[PDB]
Design an enzyme around this catalytic site. Structure first.
Site, PDB file in Angstrom:
ATOM      1  N   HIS A 133      -3.905  48.445 -29.060  1.00 47.52           N
ATOM      2  CA  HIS A 133      -3.914  49.896 -28.903  1.00 47.52           C
ATOM      3  C   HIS A 133      -3.024  50.606 -29.910  1.00 47.52           C
ATOM      4  O   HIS A 133      -3.181  51.816 -30.110  1.00 47.52           O
ATOM      5  CB  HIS A 133      -3.473  50.288 -27.492  1.00 47.52           C
ATOM      6  CG  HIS A 133      -4.469  49.946 -26.433  1.00 47.52           C
ATOM      7  ND1 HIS A 133      -5.779  50.373 -26.478  1.00 47.52           N
ATOM      8  CD2 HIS A 133      -4.349  49.217 -25.299  1.00 47.52           C
ATOM      9  CE1 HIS A 133      -6.423  49.920 -25.417  1.00 47.52           C
ATOM     10  NE2 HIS A 133      -5.578  49.217 -24.685  1.00 47.52           N
ATOM     11  N   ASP A 171     -10.578  41.630 -24.791  1.00 50.57           N
ATOM     12  CA  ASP A 171      -9.863  42.417 -23.797  1.00 50.57           C
ATOM     13  C   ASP A 171     -10.798  43.472 -23.219  1.00 50.57           C
ATOM     14  O   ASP A 171     -11.647  44.019 -23.924  1.00 50.57           O
ATOM     15  CB  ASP A 171      -8.639  43.074 -24.442  1.00 50.57           C
ATOM     16  CG  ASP A 171      -7.817  43.881 -23.459  1.00 50.57           C
ATOM     17  OD1 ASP A 171      -8.196  45.036 -23.171  1.00 50.57           O
ATOM     18  OD2 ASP A 171      -6.784  43.365 -22.985  1.00 50.57           O
ATOM     19  N   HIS A 173     -10.356  46.425 -22.456  1.00 47.95           N
ATOM     20  CA  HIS A 173     -10.163  47.741 -23.045  1.00 47.95           C
ATOM     21  C   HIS A 173     -10.526  47.718 -24.525  1.00 47.95           C
ATOM     22  O   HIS A 173     -10.411  46.691 -25.196  1.00 47.95           O
ATOM     23  CB  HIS A 173      -8.714  48.209 -22.875  1.00 47.95           C
ATOM     24  CG  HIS A 173      -8.303  48.395 -21.449  1.00 47.95           C
ATOM     25  ND1 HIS A 173      -7.797  47.370 -20.680  1.00 47.95           N
ATOM     26  CD2 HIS A 173      -8.329  49.488 -20.649  1.00 47.95           C
ATOM     27  CE1 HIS A 173      -7.527  47.823 -19.468  1.00 47.95           C
ATOM     28  NE2 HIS A 173      -7.841  49.105 -19.423  1.00 47.95           N
ATOM     29  N   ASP A 264      -7.690  40.754 -19.042  1.00 47.28           N
ATOM     30  CA  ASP A 264      -7.809  41.728 -17.967  1.00 47.28           C
ATOM     31  C   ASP A 264      -9.252  41.977 -17.550  1.00 47.28           C
ATOM     32  O   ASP A 264      -9.491  42.775 -16.638  1.00 47.28           O
ATOM     33  CB  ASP A 264      -7.142  43.050 -18.367  1.00 47.28           C
ATOM     34  CG  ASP A 264      -7.466  43.467 -19.788  1.00 47.28           C
ATOM     35  OD1 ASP A 264      -8.431  42.931 -20.374  1.00 47.28           O
ATOM     36  OD2 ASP A 264      -6.746  44.335 -20.320  1.00 47.28           O
ATOM     37  N   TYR A 304      -3.360  41.209 -16.282  1.00 47.58           N
ATOM     38  CA  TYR A 304      -2.258  41.564 -15.395  1.00 47.58           C
ATOM     39  C   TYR A 304      -2.371  40.889 -14.034  1.00 47.58           C
ATOM     40  O   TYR A 304      -1.890  41.418 -13.030  1.00 47.58           O
ATOM     41  CB  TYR A 304      -2.164  43.080 -15.254  1.00 47.58           C
ATOM     42  CG  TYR A 304      -2.231  43.772 -16.594  1.00 47.58           C
ATOM     43  CD1 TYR A 304      -1.110  43.851 -17.409  1.00 47.58           C
ATOM     44  CD2 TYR A 304      -3.421  44.312 -17.060  1.00 47.58           C
ATOM     45  CE1 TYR A 304      -1.168  44.468 -18.642  1.00 47.58           C
ATOM     46  CE2 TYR A 304      -3.489  44.930 -18.291  1.00 47.58           C
ATOM     47  CZ  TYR A 304      -2.359  45.005 -19.079  1.00 47.58           C
ATOM     48  OH  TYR A 304      -2.420  45.620 -20.307  1.00 47.58           O
TER      49      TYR A 304
END
Ligand SMILES: CCCc1nc2ccccn2c1Nc1ccc(C(=O)NO)cc1
Ligand SMILES: [K+]
Ligand SMILES: [K+]
Ligand SMILES: [Zn+2]
Length: 357
Positions: A133, A171, A173, A264, A304
């Site tokens: 990110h 991932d 995201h 995640d 997580y």
């Protein structure tokens, strides 16, 4: 023929002082590591030493201003740490955060070095904080510096500038930082799989959509695979790899494969809401291993659930070590929205990749 593994306890010193239960816990890298010891995977690996990334190395992707700010976080009062943390989207800062970011970047630099010289065949990096990110000028979503992008640029800097680097971001995201960093670049093919829900999912931007195929010279070198319509699992990621990731990757013919391995999207994650099993992650790793003569670096990002990420990344390390892939489910079919997504990506990227035509 040997698998490197880099891990440093010191990367746990980055923490959230205002929320002790914020999901980006320091134990994430330790727990995973412990699994690698107790499944006796660590015994079969070559331990790569962690190190600090230099500021000239951070300059490969980040502006001097951003570096100088995060560096100034090193000596700050807690009130100033909160003040600077609130200037970014989804960022908490500690006095130790800058050092831990440097440790992640340097660890991945040493891993890429051990791969590109011939010391190891493939490698895995159990690092934190994550990086995909982070952008050239700003910190975002638990990330300070873009570890994957910096590892690609460094890999080019210790070989040649034109070295074909494939970044596969699985991932859940979207890696906005990596996309924007390599948006106009044809030497680094960026492919991402991410929950999108038409902008309703973080990072909540239409930049994660399938129509973003790059800019100018780097057009077609940015593949976005966005998921819509609830939970996805092994069938959908397996289909996306079968019809998109592996054909495009094989046509690209990369010489180094970096995996933004956020976990995640795994079963039991409180933030992703997907159900990708550890055996599915094993199959994706096994598929990526057939590229670039096996030169694959698995960089930890998100994820997580301590048990989920420990099991999943342990499976990836097993595939890197040469074990045979566990049998997987029956898939059944795919959520129709996933087939629609794959077809949208295919229509967007067919002009650039003949193996899609
Ligand atoms: C869970 C703590 C904070 C939070 N709560 C929400 C709710 C909706 C949308 C975004 N949220 C965020 N911010 C995130 C930023 C980055 C990531 C990431 O990169 N995971 O890998 C995850 C969450
Ligand atoms: K991704
Ligand atoms: K690119
Ligand atoms: Zn994530």
């Amino acid at each position: 023929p040997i698998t490197g593994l880099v891990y440093d306890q010191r990367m746990m010193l980055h923490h959230n002082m205002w929320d002790s239960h914020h999901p980006e816990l320091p134990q994430r890298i330790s727990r995973i590591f412990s699994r690698h010891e107790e499944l006796r995977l660590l015994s079969r690996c070559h331990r790569i030493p962690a190190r600090l990334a230099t500021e000239e190395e951070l300059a490969l992707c980040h502006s001097s201003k951003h570096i100088s700010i995060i560096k100034s976080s090193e000596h700050m009062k807690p009130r100033d740490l909160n003040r600077l943390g609130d200037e970014y989207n989804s960022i908490f800062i500690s006095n130790e955060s800058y050092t831990c970011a440097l440790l992640a970047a340097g660890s991945c630099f040493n891993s890429a070095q051990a791969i590109l010289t011939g010391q190891v065949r493939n490698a895995v990096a159990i690092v934190r904080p994550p990086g995909h990110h982070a952008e050239k000028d700003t910190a975002c979503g638990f990330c300070f510096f873009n570890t994957a992008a910096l590892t690609a640029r460094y890999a080019q800097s210790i070989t040649r500038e034109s070295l074909r680097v494939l970044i596969v971001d699985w991932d859940v995201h979207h890696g906005n930082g990596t996309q924007h960093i390599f948006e106009e670049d044809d030497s680094v093919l960026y492919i991402s799989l991410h929950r999108y829900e038409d902008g309703a999912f973080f990072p909540n931007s239409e930049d994660a959509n399938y129509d973003k195929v790059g800019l100018g010279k780097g057009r077609g070198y940015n593949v976005n695979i966005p998921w819509n319509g609830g939970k996805m699992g092994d069938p959908e990621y397996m289909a996306a790899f079968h019809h998109l990731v592996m054909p495009i990757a094989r046509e690209f013919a990369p010489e180094l494969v970096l995996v933004s391995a956020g976990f995640d999207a795994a079963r039991g994650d409180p933030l992703g809401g997907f159900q990708v099993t550890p055996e599915g992650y094993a199959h994706l790793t096994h598929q990526l291993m057939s590229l670039a003569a096996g030169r694959v670096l698995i960089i930890l990002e998100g994820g997580y659930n301590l048990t989920s990420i420990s099991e999943s990344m342990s499976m990836c390390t097993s595939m890197l070590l040469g074990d045979s892939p566990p049998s997987l489910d029956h898939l059944t079919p795919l959520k129709t929205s996933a087939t629609v997504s794959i077809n949208n990506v295919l229509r967007a990227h067919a002009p650039f990749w003949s193996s899609l035509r």
